[PDB]
Design a protein around this ligand. Structure first.
Ligand SMILES: [Ca+2]
Ligand SMILES: [Ca+2]
Lengths: 224, 229
């Protein structure tokens, strides 16, 4: 699709870039020492201040499919988001929050989604006091090398599942895929109730093996 | 009949620490750091503050690392985290150590020093971000299933000795239809099986990793309780 712009550089962006290999990514940062790592990761480097409108334009934010924002502090991240919104009101903005208390301000500035790595981290650590299964779960289903992965499968128009409940769909027994959620618009229902009825456009959030995932895609396709 | 839980030690201060402490309200926690500016933050969360160097064995001794329920390590760099872990292992070879890694390449070195579990917030973050380009459902899930205020939570439920499920396969156990809890994994020792096969057979000591409503969770606990009390 369209290129992705990343504003700022942290240790998050390095791991982000690694997963986005094969997509057109522009990294806008003012730290020149980072240029070589950016190129090594397969991305393009654009030197400038992401809180400056003219530099966001240089990165072609107005033609991006999304902008990911993670500057050194939350106030700078907010400043950058405000600059993006002056240029492009509709472009999807994903931002990293440093502090929990600032999340609402990141949204208010214009972020469509906020990710708080240190909230996630602190919560996983406190939950790892006796055993690490919850932390193992989160880190395994996000890793590519895992046999069992977390995927999103959209329910197409004319799907065999349209109008069918979670209970009657019997997705785990039929396909081997665990439904952990169904999402639509900006809403996510985790562990949907048996009487939730699938709609075309619903996104199924599932966990399964690659062959289980294919069985799921076939099961929910339109009749032939 | 409930033996008091042992204290937890936290070494260092990062932005993870504030949220960690918030979740450990109601348990005995000691925080060892050499930054005095954090003392008020520690007391405000209900924990105790110990001023000292976490890479210094005597200060680790002072922070009651010995006999702790767990030690959580999050220093400013991976080399310093490693230095701290080595100090802990000279004091207590068996205590459970959880460490925060700054850079991915250092994870195995942290494990080698003595960490039983490594958590990498920038790896998690980078991956969630990369998955959020079009929509945010995976990031919403991870952050939602970890929050206390959610109607649907991720929990760990142990299979008790003499359980009805002992010897019972996942298929025959029919846990989701019986209790309403999604089984996302089963754990034991340092190992986790995500989404166990139909013919996996439950054992006493197994930990069920599940997602459900509080009442569904209670139904799981009754279903798997011992036949004989
Ligand atoms: Ca399966
Ligand atoms: Ca349920």
């Amino acid at each position: 699709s369209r290129h992705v712009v990343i504003c700022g550089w942290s240790e998050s962006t390095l791991e982000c870039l690694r997963e986005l290999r094969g997509s057109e990514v522009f990294v806008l940062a003012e730290d020149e020492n980072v240029r070589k790592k950016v190129l090594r990761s397969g991305a393009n480097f654009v030197h400038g201040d992401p809180t400056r409108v003219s530099d966001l334009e240089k990165a072609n934010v107005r033609g991006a499919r999304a902008v990911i924002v993670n500057l050194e502090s939350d106030s700078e991240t907010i400043h950058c988001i405000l600059g993006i919104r002056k240029i492009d009101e509709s472009v999807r903005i994903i931002a990293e929050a440093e502090r929990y208390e600032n999340i609402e301000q990141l949204r208010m500035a214009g972020a469509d989604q906020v990710i708080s790595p240190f909230v996630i981290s602190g919560r996983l650590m406190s939950r790892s006091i006796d055993d690490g299964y919850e932390a193992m779960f989160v880190q395994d289903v996000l890793a590519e090398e895992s046999t069992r992965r977390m995927v999103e499968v959209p329910i197409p128009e004319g799907s065999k599942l349209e109008g069918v409940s979670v209970l009657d769909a019997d997705i785990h027994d039929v396909t081997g895929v665990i439904i952990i959620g169904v999402g639509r618009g900006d809403e996510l229902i985790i562990d949907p109730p048996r009487d939730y009825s699938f709609r075309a456009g619903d996104i199924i959030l599932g966990i399964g093996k690659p062959e289980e995932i294919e069985r799921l895609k076939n099961y929910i396709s339109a009749l032939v």
